[PDB]
């Protein structure tokens, strides 16, 4: 219909939001967008309201914005970030210039939870089961997260987990240099752009996380791109001819071929004392050849999640049309598409 908005400045940022959102409290403003915690009188939930800064200041930003709303609008799974609401103070496409997105306020991320030490195998089972369940859903819609890491997994007081911060959007630049956590979870093939990557890059990420939850230590904390690849090949062994034939860059193949060949290590001797089913699963996730990596759907069926696996309660997504990525529009055409999606949004029904 059209709710009543109320203007108000916070941390020198103007927030014009509907009255249903109350007690707006700054909670960290990144370059991507300003964030606020608030209470949503209509759902009863404490929420996170992100105000995108300059959503249409460029064709790429304008397309990123569009991409993010389309993405958040489609995601409907217990283990994936959902869109509770999206809105703009603008009454016309003419003045339409700001985008706000609302979602359940997630308290702590996976870091907080592991930071203190390794957890019980039972908790490792639960947490990883949830990441794979949401990932099965995400992949089913032909989507690739691209940036799975502890800080992008929100965990609640009962160890319930939601996946967020989809890669699809940002363009990891100069942020992957040096001894940085952001890169420690990337599959090698995408890290050194050996080839055009698939969804198993996400499975590689889960394996890195699973190992860290078991040992309480980062698996491949390389000090740079090369040191990290070296840490990965020491564990997984160097590429074989089969894999090498799949790396595009004649330079990457050349480089790889300059490295003394190494055999795969014994994971049992790496993850000492870990449940054998866990080790077996890690060996299936941490495979150099991405074509041979295990899938989310397959992993769920692995005997490591016997206590949680239920094929009937592990949904897939509705088909997700991403043809707009090959679309060539102008800022304004992206803007209007964004606006149509803002205007068309239908809220998730609560009881
Ligand atoms: F609609 C959205 C979508 C994504 C984010 C959102 N984007 C990033 N983060 C993580 C922290 C840095 C804010 C969130 C977030 C913050 C608090 N609670 C849950 C999610 C916020 C609102």
């Amino acid at each position: 219909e059209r709710p009543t908005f109320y203007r108000q400045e916070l941390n020198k940022t103007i927030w014009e939001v509907p009255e249903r959102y109350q007690n707006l409290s700054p909670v960290g403003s990144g370059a991507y967008g300003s964030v606020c915690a608030a209470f949503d009188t209509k759902t009863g939930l404490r929420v996170a309201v992100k105000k995108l800064s300059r959503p249409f200041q460029s064709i790429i930003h304008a397309k990123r914005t569009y991409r993010e709303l389309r993405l958040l609008k489609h995601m409907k799974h217990e283990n994936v970030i959902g869109l509770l609401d999206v809105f703009t103070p603008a009454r016309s496409l003419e003045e339409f210039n700001d985008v706000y997105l609302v979602t359940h306020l997630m308290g702590a991320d996976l870091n907080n939870i592991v930071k203190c030490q390794k957890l019980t195998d039972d908790h490792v089972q639960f947490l990883i089961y949830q990441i794979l369940r949401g990932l099965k859903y995400i992949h089913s819609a032909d989507i690739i997260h691209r940036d799975l890491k502890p800080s992008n997994l929100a965990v609640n007081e009962d160890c319930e987990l939601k996946i967020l911060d989809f890669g699809l959007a940002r363009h990891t630049d100069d942020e992957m240099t040096g001894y940085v956590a952001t890169r420690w979870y990337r599959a090698p093939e995408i890290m050194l752009n050996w080839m055009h990557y698939n969804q198993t890059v996400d499975i590689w990420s889960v394996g890195c996380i699973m190992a860290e939850l078991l040992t309480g230590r980062t698996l491949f904390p390389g000090t740079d791109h090369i040191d990290q690849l070296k840490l990965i090949l020491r564990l997984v062994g160097t590429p074989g001819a089969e894999l090498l034939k799949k790396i595009s860059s004649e330079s990457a193949r050349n480089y790889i071929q300059s490295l003394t060949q190494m055999p795969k290590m014994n994971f049992a001797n790496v993850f000492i004392g870990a449940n054998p089913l866990a080790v077996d699963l890690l060996e299936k996730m941490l495979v150099l050849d991405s074509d041979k990596r295990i899938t989310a759907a397959q992993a769920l069926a692995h005997a490591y999640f016997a206590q949680y696996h239920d094929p009937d309660d592990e949904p897939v997504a509705d088909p997700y049309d991403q043809s707009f990525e090959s679309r060539d529009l102008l800022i304004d055409e992206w803007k209007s598409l964004t606006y149509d999606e803002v205007i068309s949004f239908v809220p998730p029904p609560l009881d």
Side-chain angles (χ1 to χ4, degrees):
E1 306 84 8
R2 254 294 300 202
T4 297
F5 291 64
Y6 73 99
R7 191 170 250 250
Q8 111 164 260
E9 183 189 89
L10 306 187
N11 284 17
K12 289 172 230 217
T13 320
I14 299 311
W15 290 64
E16 218 177 323
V17 310
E19 16 185 46
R20 54 181 291 192
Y21 301 111
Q22 298 281 327
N23 310 306
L24 260 56
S25 156
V27 101
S29 77
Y32 64 119
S34 221
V35 179
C36 257
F39 173 71
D40 169 35
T41 67
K42 318 276 243 116
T43 68
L45 314 166
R46 191 104 221 277
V47 289
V49 188
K50 194 211 290 182
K51 178 195 195 204
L52 297 184
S53 353
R54 9 199 75 41
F56 318 111
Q57 52 155 4
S58 102
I59 307 245
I60 33 164
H61 286 93
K63 178 157 183 189
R64 186 189 155 158
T65 296
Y66 180 70
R67 174 185 298 116
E68 189 180 355
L69 180 47
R70 284 282 328 265
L71 229 347
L72 260 14
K73 274 191 76 166
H74 200 257
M75 287 317 126
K76 301 175 127 62
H77 181 109
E78 315 183 321
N79 303 118
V80 183
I81 174 179
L83 231 216
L84 261 185
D85 179 35
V86 47
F87 64 77
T88 179
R91 317 175 132 274
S92 85
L93 163 59
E94 293 79 280
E95 32 153 6
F96 168 52
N97 194 241
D98 281 320
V99 180
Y100 293 78
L101 310 152
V102 190
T103 197
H104 311 80
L105 192 68
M106 314 296 345
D109 56 31
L110 195 45
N111 272 327
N112 310 133
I113 287 65
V114 207
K115 231 45 153 295
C116 321
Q117 219 129 55
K118 38 153 141 218
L119 351 166
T120 92
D121 185 62
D122 287 276
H123 285 172
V124 167
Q125 287 179 41
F126 194 43
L127 293 164
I128 305 311
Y129 168 75
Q130 296 184 82
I131 303 178
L132 294 169
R133 173 158 183 264
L135 213 59
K136 158 165 173 190
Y137 171 93
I138 292 170
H139 285 164
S140 69
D142 282 334
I143 288 150
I144 304 184
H145 196 295
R146 257 167 276 257
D147 201 19
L148 269 186
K149 47 186 192 215
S151 49
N152 289 159
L153 308 174
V155 173
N156 87 24
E157 331 85 27
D158 312 275
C159 277
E160 298 193 295
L161 165 168
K162 264 188 211 296
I163 292 171
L164 32 117
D165 249 19
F166 285 66
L168 314 85
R170 273 157 181 244
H171 320 290
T172 67
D173 172 79
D174 270 291
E175 78 195 51
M176 309 281 273
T177 310
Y179 190 60
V180 293
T182 71
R183 209 195 49 251
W184 300 338
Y185 307 84
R186 334 265 298 169
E189 75 258 22
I190 171 170
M191 182 174 78
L192 270 316
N193 286 116
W194 289 343
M195 70 205 66
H196 302 247
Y197 61 65
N198 74 328
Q199 330 197 124
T200 45
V201 298
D202 283 340
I203 293 301
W204 177 277
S205 300
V206 184
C208 289
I209 293 165
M210 174 162 174
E212 197 176 322
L213 302 186
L214 290 173
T215 77
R217 291 290 142 209
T218 305
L219 179 60
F220 302 117
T223 48
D224 62 77
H225 290 245
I226 289 323
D227 181 59
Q228 182 162 332
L229 170 70
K230 272 190 226 293
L231 295 186
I232 287 155
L233 300 188
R234 222 186 99 249
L235 171 72
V236 151
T238 56
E242 196 175 340
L243 214 198
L244 255 142
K245 268 161 97 67
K246 319 201 233 188
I247 285 153
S248 315
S249 167
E250 178 205 312
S251 199
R253 290 195 322 260
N254 269 132
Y255 175 53
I256 287 169
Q257 290 214 277
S258 74
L259 269 20
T260 307
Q261 303 182 60
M262 278 171 290
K264 215 213 96 199
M265 289 206 265
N266 199 321
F267 280 38
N269 287 148
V270 167
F271 307 105
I272 332 273
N275 163 359
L277 287 189
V279 178
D280 180 75
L281 179 59
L282 282 180
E283 267 161 37
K284 302 242 179 64
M285 284 175 154
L286 270 12
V287 170
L288 200 45
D289 202 326
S290 69
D291 283 339
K292 311 196 177 200
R293 242 167 243 163
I294 194 177
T295 61
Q298 281 180 273
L300 289 176
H302 196 273
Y304 181 56
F305 314 112
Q307 333 279 340
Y308 305 95
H309 183 224
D310 180 349
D312 292 304
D313 197 6
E314 293 173 356
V316 290
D318 277 318
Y320 171 75
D321 187 326
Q322 354 188 15
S323 46
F324 69 94
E325 299 275 18
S326 312
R327 211 83 285 137
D328 185 42
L329 308 169
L330 338 122
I331 302 216
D332 303 84
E333 277 165 351
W334 281 127
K335 191 146 150 164
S336 162
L337 247 28
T338 294
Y339 183 77
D340 265 338
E341 290 286 339
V342 164
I343 267 49
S344 74
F345 178 71
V346 167
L350 82 162
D351 271 45

